[PDB]
């Protein structure tokens, strides 16, 4: 679980409207619902409002997947 669901944003969004949120690329934005095919419900810097669906990615890769790669490996001392 009933939690908001975390998403990160694609692209910028600049709302028209009280109830449309606004963004940066790159922030974290919350989901609650989709009111409609396009647009989701949610909560971005303490306000609730809506912004489209396509412009946000919802946070589902495990950092399982992210163990990879020489910069991280070395980090962590894989190889000593």
């Given at each position: 679980?009933?939690?908001?669901?975390?998403?990160?944003?694609?692209?910028?969004?600049?709302?028209?409207?009280?109830?449309?949120l606004s963004?940066?690329?790159?922030?974290?934005?919350?989901?609650?619902?989709?009111?409609?095919?396009?647009?989701?419900?949610?909560?971005?810097?303490g306000?609730?409002?809506?912004?489209?669906?396509?412009?946000?990615?919802k946070?589902?890769?495990?950092?399982?997947?992210?163990?990879?790669?020489?910069?991280y490996?070395r980090?962590?001392?894989?190889?000593?």
């Amino acid at each position: 679980q009933g939690a908001l669901l975390p998403a990160k944003a694609v692209y910028d969004f600049k709302a028209q409207t009280s109830k449309e949120l606004s963004f940066k690329k790159g922030d974290t934005v919350y989901i609650l619902r989709k009111i409609d095919q396009n647009w989701y419900e949610g909560e971005h810097h303490g306000r609730v409002g809506i912004f489209p669906i396509s412009y946000v990615e919802k946070l589902t890769g495990s950092a399982a997947a992210l163990r990879t790669g020489e910069a991280y490996l070395r980090y962590v001392d894989a190889a000593a």
